[PDB]
Enzyme design. Structure first.
Site, PDB file in Angstrom:
ATOM      1  CD  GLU A  35      64.634  53.969  29.818  1.00 33.47           C
ATOM      2  OE1 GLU A  35      63.916  53.537  30.758  1.00 33.47           O
ATOM      3  OE2 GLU A  35      65.891  53.996  29.877  1.00 33.47           O
ATOM      4  CG  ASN A  46      63.218  55.213  40.204  1.00 35.68           C
ATOM      5  OD1 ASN A  46      63.315  56.326  39.663  1.00 35.68           O
ATOM      6  ND2 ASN A  46      62.953  54.102  39.521  1.00 35.68           N
ATOM      7  CG  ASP A  48      66.367  57.237  44.155  1.00 40.71           C
ATOM      8  OD1 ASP A  48      65.213  57.198  43.670  1.00 40.71           O
ATOM      9  OD2 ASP A  48      67.312  57.804  43.570  1.00 40.71           O
ATOM     10  CB  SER A  50      64.039  59.825  41.959  1.00 38.82           C
ATOM     11  OG  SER A  50      64.513  58.553  41.524  1.00 38.82           O
ATOM     12  CG  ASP A  52      62.992  56.728  35.964  1.00 35.26           C
ATOM     13  OD1 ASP A  52      63.643  57.472  36.718  1.00 35.26           O
ATOM     14  OD2 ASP A  52      63.420  55.618  35.583  1.00 35.26           O
ATOM     15  CG  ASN A  59      65.723  59.936  38.294  1.00 30.84           C
ATOM     16  OD1 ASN A  59      66.361  60.618  39.104  1.00 30.84           O
ATOM     17  ND2 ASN A  59      64.982  58.893  38.658  1.00 30.84           N
ATOM     18  CG  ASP A 101      75.709  65.169  32.349  1.00 30.34           C
ATOM     19  OD1 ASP A 101      75.469  66.292  32.840  1.00 30.34           O
ATOM     20  OD2 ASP A 101      76.251  64.250  33.007  1.00 30.34           O
TER      21      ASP A 101
END
EC number: 3.2.1.17
Lengths: 127, 128, 127, 128
Positions: A35, A46, A48, A50, A52, A59, A101
């Site tokens: 990562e 990103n 969209d 957002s 990271d 995110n 999650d």
């Protein structure tokens, strides 16, 4: 800061990630390798809106607040800058919330593509 | 977070220099789109200043990465692309328009940007 | 008797360490035979001192070369083999037995031994 | 010292090697690239007891005296240690004596294998 592999493995172990929710330590070190290549300041914007953040590229849409991401939920209730700290405490605390999650570490694209199903312990040997 | 290899590629005053740096190469599209990056750092070679930056392939950071060094007043941009094979572990480097002036210490600085030594020793690469 | 990668490979007290460094790699015969070399240099990383040396393929020096760092303290030998393709501006690196301790600054020093920065700036690499 | 390519080209030109005995500058730069990769301290021990010295890997059997080579002719009248200097002068002076033979630059194995018959001017391309 760029962590050494064993240096990061030891830090992650101290913060309780070894076998957390069944994921042995090497999974976490391997996830960080792909990562961020162990760089605490890593950031990826990103399409969209957002971004990271940090060593585990967490995110901003669901997990941290950077004040510029649409649909923010800030479920780790922390500013994204906290995930860019030189120590990994904030990133580990937030990662523990993410991996519990439901789909576990599949939350990390890098873990799925480069770590899942491999000899992940390799990442903590020689330490 | 803002001055990046991606921004240099698009900047009106630096795009020609970036194009000169990558001419003849086949960098992945992720480089110009903007990969996973860290802030630019300053290094001095001789009595000249460079902004050194790097970026890696999103979610495959340890496999593919790039470092670029840029001198604003010199209008020069040189770089280093690195791909690590997931079967042999061999690291293949591609040097991007390294001019003779940067053929020795510049190569060292660019590689240090990728290993992590430059980020950890910010004032350790200012060669005389 | 100059200290060289070739002398380390043949040395009674260092041969075992050389074999471990090249384990799994099949290097050209010129390395053990003794290529074109320069004097070893002292580099201190942390509180560890190393002798760093390099050699290149006789009469084809710009095409293939190798750098090695040797710690008597640990006996350990770590290296870097490099082959160059001028026509593609490419360079293929093979990392030889790089333990975690040398994974960041050690790699930088070995690369500096090959670019020429270590020889031109002998006191600039004691990280 | 490790020279940069264009840095060495400039020094060789200042030393009178461009077109010396009909060999254009690129030939000399290319020979140094493949004999020592532009490293003034390069040394290569040979099985016959002689050693090649310096940026142009001049041999101790016929050209310089290193005090440990049987049959040394010392045709350049120079200690081999003088060919390991950061200034290329001693090596150039000796190279001129060496090349002034009917076989010319064929005296350098590296030149024969990597330079002879090629577009050697490429080695000074982009150089000021």
């Amino acid at each position: 800061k760029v962590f050494g592999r064993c240096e990061l493995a030891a830090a992650m172990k101290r913060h309780g990630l070894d076998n957390y929710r069944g994921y042995s330590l090497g999974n976490w070190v391997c996830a960080a390798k792909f990562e961020s290549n162990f760089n605490t300041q890593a950031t990826n914007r990103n399409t969209d809106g957002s971004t990271d953040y940090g060593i585990l590229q967490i995110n901003s849409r669901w997990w941290c607040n950077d004040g510029r991401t649409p649909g923010s939920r800030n479920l780790c209730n922390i500013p994204c800058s906290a995930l860019l700290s030189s120590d990994i405490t904030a990133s580990v605390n937030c990662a523990k919330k993410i991996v519990s999650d439901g789909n576990g570490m599949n939350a990390w694209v890098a873990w799925r593509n480069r770590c899942k199903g491999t000899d992940v312990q390799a990442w903590i040997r020689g330490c | 977070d803002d001055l990046t290899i991606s921004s240099l590629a698009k900047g009106e005053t630096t795009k020609a220099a970036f194009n000169q740096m990558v001419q003849g190469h086949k960098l992945p599209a992720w480089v110009m789109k903007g990969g996973t990056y860290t802030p630019a750092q300053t290094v001095t070679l001789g009595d000249e200043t460079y902004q050194v930056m790097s970026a890696c392939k999103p979610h495959d950071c340890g496999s593919q990465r790039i470092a670029v060094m840029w001198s604003e007043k010199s209008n020069q941009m040189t770089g280093l692309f690195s791909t690590i094979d997931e079967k042999t572990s061999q690291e293949k480097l591609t040097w991007l328009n390294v001019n003779d002036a940067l053929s020795i210490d510049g190569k060292t600085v660019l590689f240090a940007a990728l290993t992590g030594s430059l980020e950890n020793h910010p004032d350790g690469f200012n060669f005389r």
